[PDB]
Amino acid sequence: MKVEEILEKALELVIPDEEEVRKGREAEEELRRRLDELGVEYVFVGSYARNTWLKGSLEIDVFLLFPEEFSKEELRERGLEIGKAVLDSYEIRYAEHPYVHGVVKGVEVDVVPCYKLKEPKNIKSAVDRTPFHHKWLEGRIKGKENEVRLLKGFLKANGIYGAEYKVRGFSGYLCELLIVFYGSFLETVKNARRWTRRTVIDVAKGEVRKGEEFFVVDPVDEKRNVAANLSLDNLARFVHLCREFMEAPSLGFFKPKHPLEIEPERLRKIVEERGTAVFAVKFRKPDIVDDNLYPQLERASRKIFEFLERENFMPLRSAFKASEEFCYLLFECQIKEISRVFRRMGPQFEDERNVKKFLSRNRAFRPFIENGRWWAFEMRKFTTPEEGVRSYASTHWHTLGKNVGESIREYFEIISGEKLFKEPVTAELCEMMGVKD
Amino acid sequence: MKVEEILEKALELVIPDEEEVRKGREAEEELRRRLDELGVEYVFVGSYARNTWLKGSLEIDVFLLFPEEFSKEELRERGLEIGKAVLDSYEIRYAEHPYVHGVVKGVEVDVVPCYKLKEPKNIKSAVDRTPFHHKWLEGRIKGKENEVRLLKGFLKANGIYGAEYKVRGFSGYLCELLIVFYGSFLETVKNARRWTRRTVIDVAKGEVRKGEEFFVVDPVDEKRNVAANLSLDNLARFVHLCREFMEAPSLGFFKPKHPLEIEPERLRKIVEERGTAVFAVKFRKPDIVDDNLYPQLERASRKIFEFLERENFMPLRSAFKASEEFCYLLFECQIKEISRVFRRMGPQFEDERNVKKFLSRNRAFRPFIENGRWWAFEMRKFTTPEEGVRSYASTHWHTLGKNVGESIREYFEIISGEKLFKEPVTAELCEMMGVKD
Ligand SMILES: Nc1ccn([C@@H]2O[C@H](COP(=O)(O)OP(=O)(O)OP(=O)(O)O)[C@@H](O)[C@H]2O)c(=O)n1
Ligand SMILES: Nc1ccn([C@@H]2O[C@H](COP(=O)(O)OP(=O)(O)OP(=O)(O)O)[C@@H](O)[C@H]2O)c(=O)n1
Ligand SMILES: Nc1ccn([C@@H]2O[C@H](COP(=O)(O)OP(=O)(O)OP(=O)(O)O)[C@@H](O)[C@H]2O)c(=O)n1
Ligand SMILES: Nc1ccn([C@@H]2O[C@H](COP(=O)(O)OP(=O)(O)OP(=O)(O)O)[C@@H](O)[C@H]2O)c(=O)n1
Ligand SMILES: [Cl-]
Ligand SMILES: [Cl-]
Ligand SMILES: [Mg+2]
Ligand SMILES: [Mg+2]
Ligand SMILES: [Mn+2]
Ligand SMILES: [Mn+2]
Ligand SMILES: [Mn+2]
Ligand SMILES: [Mn+2]
Ligand SMILES: [Mn+2]
Ligand SMILES: [Mn+2]
Ligand code: NA
Ligand code: NA
């Protein structure tokens, strides 16, 4: 519909509506009231302060700024004291060091203790960096706030906004740096078409170069990769999306697809056509935060995938899902059944002592020499991937993540067929198999 | 029964019986008569001349010895003239250059034209070497002829006597050199227990050393490996047999096992227990000699094995058989059926031009990105190893040996099940699968 027209139309999917802006205003004003009456030194930072927050994602970030000659113990204790004093309800959270999360007039707020430092290079952790992040962007981002929201909304609609482990995508700070570097959403998208996995974007130097990994240099700290948490595959997906958008721009790129909502019969038919074994490991979700859970699910899934590969079941893809009560590790394999008999490698023929040992073992079939080496026919203890995974998960749960594996130890189920389809995983199965509309 | 007693008893399985020795005598005397009346210069060589021929393997080797100033054309023409003149019936054969094979008083004879040379180093091919082979052994082998027959009979009973391609074992000349080097059958067997695939036996130097390959140095020509045609696996089998013999000597080692003679029902049951796909490629035997046929069968079998491996059917072993009218390439695979769907590798995400091409193709399922690279689900044209080989043999017969592949082009059949068992291959199947008694 013309790119410039589509971007005009996309602003309404992306700019927060009216009662959200005022809901934030009322919370901000009230929070300021309460902080001011305590005489605390503070700064509002982040996307609220800069008016770059995406529609639906209202949250306020306040950093408490303390004298440089407070101890690290003194800053944390007093910081949490104030944190608790000014929020309606509160929780003591952790990202690297403690902060307080809570609510003010219905709006989520983080209050974070850090050092007040004139000029950086006195940084200790990411915490003390953050006031400098706001400082750097405040005023470079002025007049570009809707460009930021366009980029955020584009990424969100395509499932790659957020640096948290469940997503492994683009952080808010990364988005604002990109907008400063390229000047607009449109220019970011046009240029991202030529990004590679070796692209280094150095904002402070106005420079793009090549390096070992995709790296977006923090203009406040040259050692920090702002894009650290962006996965290789989400980078690839973004580059491709940028290419697709420019070739045929549409408002559709700013709107999430409503899920496939497939009937168990159609999935049964798809699985029949592909001729694969499709199954899931079901177990109880451990009570840990997403940033801990998701890496364990990734690990568990890979270890089982690697097991299926090693055992010659020719796994195609895996996926995973956490519902409220259960987790699911999903697998599709090209082999439904393998033979009972396999080949065990023995010693080189010269090695008399070890040959004697190899041949000592009772077997149904006679060992043979092939290419200078002994081999034996021996028998598998499982012939399907489901039987294999039942054995693996029963015996090797110690390698499936601390909490995920402990859960699997207490209870797991292998589910396939019309049964697997009853679980809340059909969406994920359809994606894994590349099912079309 | 005591080793020295067993060897005494083995002499009667190995020394030619009475009417064989005299049948040879009568043929030798008659051949001498006919050669002498032509005034031809000749020498009887080989195992007949040295009284080292195994029981049942009577054949006479005569080399016609010509002046050194005959041409290579003159020696071949005149050599075949005499060859034809003195044998009862004859055929013009080929090993490297032509010779005559025929019969005298019921006994097979080869007559071979070569140069009469005083001292070697004037050799042209293997042909002119052979009089020197006899010269070297005549008299070193005296009193050791029964040691040679013991070794030959031991190897024959275990299927590894003969350097021809069907066997890839030990030649007669190799056996006699071994006896000279070690002094006896028993000492050859004791010492062969420590042979490796790098063992070099240098008869003329009285030396065993290490080298790149198993090598038995011809005492008449230091560049010639007398054991050239011995396969690695037959070497391994001999070393193992030597170890087994010394641990528990028996007359059984000089007696061929009578074949397994299995019933189709028992093989059906074995195949069921193993859970494999067992099948054969049947085609008409081309009319070529064994030394040409067997390498082609080996090649055809390997190419199809490599195909089965490449196509993820997990072949265990292969074998082959030639009957009078047909050839059979036999296979056992761990996968009976693979899924319809597989994964096709596409380009790296950066490569826009090739990504566009990869994604252009119509497919039932959507391609995906994994680890920085595109992949597509696509569909196999076969899901069993039998269907795969029908396709491979139909399309790639050009790679299955000149004559074997041409035969397969005209006609082949894939056979499995109660059908495969009707063919004269059950012996070979039982060996391939390591079936016990
Ligand atoms: N684990 C974290 C979380 C945040 N930050 C920093 O804290 C500030 C605010 O973080 P965040 O709320 O995630 O970013 P926003 O810009 O406010 O974006 P959003 O709208 O998604 O909240 C940023 O300067 C960021 O670099 C960080 O270093 N490490
Ligand atoms: N490269 C590999 C990986 C493992 N395995 C086999 O698979 C088993 C499980 O390996 P893994 O899946 O990595 O599970 P862990 O519990 O991490 O391994 P382990 O029990 O040996 O500590 C191993 O014990 C080993 O016998 C193997 O043969 N070769
Ligand atoms: N293709 C061949 C065949 C034979 N020879 C030589 O010809 C002679 C006789 O060969 P052969 O008949 O195979 O050996 P025998 O000692 O007579 O043993 P056998 O009892 O098996 O016939 C030997 O010196 C051997 O080295 C050769 O060089 N190349
Ligand atoms: N290392 C290999 C071997 C072969 N193949 C595929 O398998 C086919 C057959 O290969 P081969 O069994 O070696 O048969 P040839 O007839 O010898 O090969 P070609 O038809 O390519 O000349 C090839 O065309 C190729 O597509 C492959 O992908 N990779
Ligand atoms: Cl910030
Ligand atoms: Cl000889
Ligand atoms: Mg926040
Ligand atoms: Mg001969
Ligand atoms: Mn924020
Ligand atoms: Mn919070
Ligand atoms: Mn383990
Ligand atoms: Mn001979
Ligand atoms: Mn002959
Ligand atoms: Mn081909
Ligand atoms: Na187990
Ligand atoms: Na074909």
B391: contact with A, CB 8 A cutoff: no
Q: How many CB pairs under 8 A join A and B?
A: 136
Q: Which residues of B377-400 are buried (b: 16+ CB within 10 A; e: fewer)?
A: bebbebbbbbebbbebbeeebeeb
Q: Which residues of B touch A342 (CB under 8 A)?
A: 316, 334
**CATH 3.30.460.10 in chain B, residue ranges:** 16-143
Q: First CA to last CA across chain A, in angstroms?
A: 24
- DSSP three-state, residue B258: coil
Residue intervals in chain A for CATH 1.10.1410.30 = 1-15+144-259
How many beta carbons lie within 10 A of that of residue B358, not counting itself?
A: 17
DSSP H helical ranges for B15-125:
18-38, 46-49, 72-86
- How far apart are alpha carbons B249 and B241 in whole angstroms? 10
Contact B371 A232 (CB under 8 A): yes
Pairing of strands A90-94, A215-218: unpaired
Which ligand has the nearest atom to the CA of A45? 5
The class of domain B1-15+144-259 in CATH terms is mainly alpha
**What is the CA(B167)–ligand 12 centre distance, in A?**
16
User: What distances in angstroms separate CA A73 from CA A35, A97, A100, A111, A115, one per listed residue?
Assistant: 21, 11, 16, 17, 12
Mutate to test the pocket of ligand 2, among A299, A310, A408 (most ligand atoms within 8 A of CB): A310
B53, B47, B41, B50: which is closest to B16 by C-alpha?
B53
The alpha carbon of residue A378 is apart from the nearest alpha carbon of chain B, in Å, by: 9
CB < 8 Å to A339, chain B:
274-276, 314, 316, 333-336
A131 lines ligand 1 (CB under 6 A): no
The answer, yes or no, to whether any atom of ligand 3 lies below 6 A from the CB of B130, is yes
In terms of CA atoms, which chain B residue is nearest residue A198?
A: B350
Residues 6+ apart with CB under 8 A from A218: A129, A133, A203, A224, A225, A226
B342 contacts in chain A (CB < 8 Å): 316, 334
What angle in degrees, to the nearest 10, is found between the helix axes of B426-433 and B264-274? 30
Task: Using an 8 Å CB-CB cutoff, list chain A residues near B345.
Answer: none
Tokens of A47: 């996307």
Closest CA to B228 of B281, B190, B280, B177: B177
Interface residue B359 vs chain A (CB under 8 A):
no
Q: From CA B147, how far away is CA B141, in angstroms rounded?
A: 9
Q: Cα–Cα distance between A241 and B210 in angstroms, integer?
A: 63
Compute the distance between CA of residue B334 and CA of residue B317 in angstroms, rounded to an integer.
10
Nearest of B155, B154, B201 to residue B181 by alpha carbon? B201
Question: By CB neighbour count within 10 A (0-12 exposed, 13-18 middle, 19+ buried), where does A404 fall?
Answer: buried
Count of helix runs (H) and strand runs (E) in chain B: 16, 16
Q: Are strands B368-370 and B326-333 parallel, antiparallel or unpaired?
A: unpaired
CB–CB contact B275 A340 (8 Å): yes
Strands A277-284 and A326-333: antiparallel
Establish if B365 touches chain A: CB-CB under 8 angstroms.
Answer: yes
Q: Is A338 on the interface with B (CB under 8 A)?
A: yes
Q: How far apart are the first and last CA of chain B?
A: 24
CA–CA dist B400, B299 (Å, integer): 6
- Elucidation method: X-ray
B316 contacts on A by Cβ (under 8 Å): 339, 341-343, 377
Residue B95 amino acid letter: A
Give the separation between CA A187 and CA A178, rounded to whole angstroms: 10
Residue B355 touches partner A, C-beta closer than 8 Å: yes
At residue A366, φ and ψ (nearest 5 deg) are -80, 130
B338 reaches A (C-beta below 8 A): yes
Q: How many CB atoms lie within 10 A of CB B425?
A: 22
Contact B316 A343 (CB under 8 A): yes
Q: What is the DSSP letter of A44?
A: E
CB atoms within 10 A of CB A281: 25
Protein fold of A16-143: Beta Polymerase; domain 2 (3.30.460)
Task: Enumerate residues 6+ apart whose C-beta is below 8 A from B278.
Answer: B271, B330, B331, B332, B333, B416, B420, B429, B433
Residues 241-280 of B with CB under 8 A from A: 243, 273-276
Report the alpha-carbon distance of residue A168 to residue A170 in Å, rounded.
Answer: 7
Is some CB atom of chain B closer than 8 A to the CB atom of A382? no
Farthest CA pair distance, chain B: 88
**Those residues with Cβ within 8 angstroms of residue A200's Cβ, 6 or more apart along the chain or in another chain:** A208, A209, A210, A211, A214, A215, A216, A217
Q: Is A372 on the interface with B (CB under 8 A)?
A: yes
Ligand 2 contact, A122 CB (< 6 A): no
CB A13 within 8 A of CB A255: yes
Q: Which residues does chain A have within 8 Å of residue B236's beta carbon, measured at their own beta carbons?
A: 349, 369, 372
Chain B residues 294-323 with CB within 8 Å of chain A: 312, 314, 316-317
Q: Is A59 annotated as a binding residue?
A: yes
For chain A, give every residue range classified as CATH 3.30.70.590.
260-339+384-437
User: Is CATH 3.40.50.970 the classification given to domain B340-383?
Assistant: no
CATH 3.30.70.1550 residue window(s) in chain B:
340-383
- What CATH number labels A260-339+384-437? 3.30.70.590
Measured in angstroms, how far is the CA atom of residue B234 from the centroid of ligand 3? 19
Check pocket membership of B55 for ligand 3, CB cut-off 6 A. no
Strands B207-210, B341-348: pairing is unpaired
- Residue B307 CA: nearest ligand 4 atom is 12
